[PDB]
Amino acid sequence: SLIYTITLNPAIDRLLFIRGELEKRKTNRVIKTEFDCGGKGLHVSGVLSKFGIKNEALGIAGSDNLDKLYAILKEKHINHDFLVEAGTSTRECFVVLSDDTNGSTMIPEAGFTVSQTNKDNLLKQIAKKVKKEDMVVIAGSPPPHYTLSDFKELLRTVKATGAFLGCDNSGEYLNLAVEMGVDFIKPNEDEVIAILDEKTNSLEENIRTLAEKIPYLVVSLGAKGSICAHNGKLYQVIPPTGAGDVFVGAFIAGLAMNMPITETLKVATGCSASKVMQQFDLEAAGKLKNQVSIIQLE
């Protein structure tokens, strides 16, 4: 079988290294510039590959900076079959970083408007490629004007093939994903409250309730860690940006390698924490795996 990632609104991450903090009306000189691939799906493909797990990235890229995007993907050993929109450029997400600090300021471009033709090409692309034994991971939110309506066809077209379907989205797209019934989603506390529009029950109850529709539910609680529901059980995951994408990637890898869920959660969490410490190193992420603690909630 195979794993497919779908990055509707890909990007090129441009790391801008400056000295100290980022003043907000001052001039901040860049010491050096660094590039990496952007888009949730892509980040997820990057993790899968480090795990020696086969996968292919799908999405819509711009023509004008394609060569640059491909060099990065080749470097991150990411197999892809992108659709290309002529006369446009993949957006960039400027990441103002710093060795002198541990912060990061994000300034992502909105991305371009996708042509109707490439929307349809993505649909058959999925029909022609995805099998029931495969897994699909639509990650990152849609580019401007890729409507909820468009998103609906996308999800249904995937479901129609019977493959595992995970979605890392937000806003009405996440809600929509839930209503459609995907196998995986990683909402934050508040997104959970939003999806249900319920504010009087405990979060726990919101999650157990939501687990009735999503079989691999993982709710991020920020620094506190996470809560994952699966097979009737609820787990509190306690750890010792892009951290969320790596978590997804790691989590998918675990399921792909078919390892215990509690175990998958320790690996996912070890890799996510491994980055919140990096400007990730898989080897380095492995030392954190067994520092992660799981607490089953009864």
Ligand X SMILES: O=P(O)(O)OC[C@H]1O[C@](O)(CO)[C@@H](O)[C@H]1O
Query: Does residue 223 belong to the site contacting a second copy (CB under 8 A)?
Result: no
Contacting range for a second copy; rule: CB under 8 A; set: 23-31, 132-140, 232-240, 242-250 = 23-31
Please indicate if the annotation marks 119 as binding a ligand. Answer: no
With contacts defined by CB under 8 A, how many residues of the chain interact with a second copy? Answer: 25
The single residue among 3, 6, 11, 271 that binds ligand X, judged by CB under 6 A, is 11
Query: Does residue 187 belong to the site contacting ligand X (CB under 6 A)?
Result: no
Nearer to Mg ion, 161 or 170 (CB): 170
Contacting range for a second copy; rule: CB under 8 A; set: 105-113, 121-129, 186-194, 257-265 = 105-113
The number of beta carbons lying within 10 Å of the beta carbon of residue 105 is: 16
Question: Binding mask 155-184 vs Mg ion (x if CB under 5 A, - otherwise)?
Answer: ---------------x--------------
20 binds, among Mg ion, ligand X, a second copy, none (CB under 5 to 8 A by kind): none
Cβ atoms of 213 and 221 closer than 8 Å? no
Least distance (Å) from a second copy to the CB of residue 62? 12
Nearer to a second copy, 99 or 179 (CB): 99
Nearer to a second copy, 110 or 223 (CB): 110
Q: What is the largest CA-CA distance in the chain?
A: 56
Burial of 138 from C-beta contacts in 10 A (0-12 / 13-18 / 19+):
buried
Contacting range for a second copy; rule: CB under 8 A; set: 2-10, 108-116, 126-134, 209-217 = 108-116
31 binds, among a second copy, ligand X, Mg ion, none (CB under 5 to 8 A by kind): a second copy
The number of beta carbons lying within 10 Å of the beta carbon of residue 84 is: 13
Name the β-bridge partners of 34: 15
The candidate with the shortest Cα–Cα distance to 221, out of 198, 187, 193, is 187
The single residue among 1, 19, 20, 30 that binds a second copy, judged by CB under 8 A, is 30
Report the first-to-last Cα separation within the chain, whole angstroms: 35
The answer for residues whose C-beta is within 8 angstroms of residue 209's C-beta and 6 or more apart is 196, 198, 201
Query: Does residue 245 belong to the site contacting ligand X (CB under 6 A)?
Result: yes
Number of residues written out for the chain: 298
What Cα–Cα distance (Å) separates residue 31 from each residue in 34, 92, 104, 107, 125? 10, 19, 15, 18, 42
Query: Does residue 26 belong to the site contacting a second copy (CB under 8 A)?
Result: yes
Nearer to ligand X, 40 or 230 (CB): 40
Q: Which helix (H) or strand (E) holds 285?
A: helix 282-289
Residue 260 and residue 268: Cα distance in Å, rounded? 12
The candidate with the shortest Cα–Cα distance to 169, out of 198, 145, 148, is 148
Residues forming the site for a second copy (CB under 8 A): 16, 18, 21-33, 94, 96, 103-110
Residues forming the site for ligand X (CB under 6 A): 9, 11, 13, 38-40, 43, 93, 108, 140-141, 241-242, 244-245
- Give the residue ranges of the annotated binding site: 186, 188, 212, 220, 222, 225, 242, 244-245
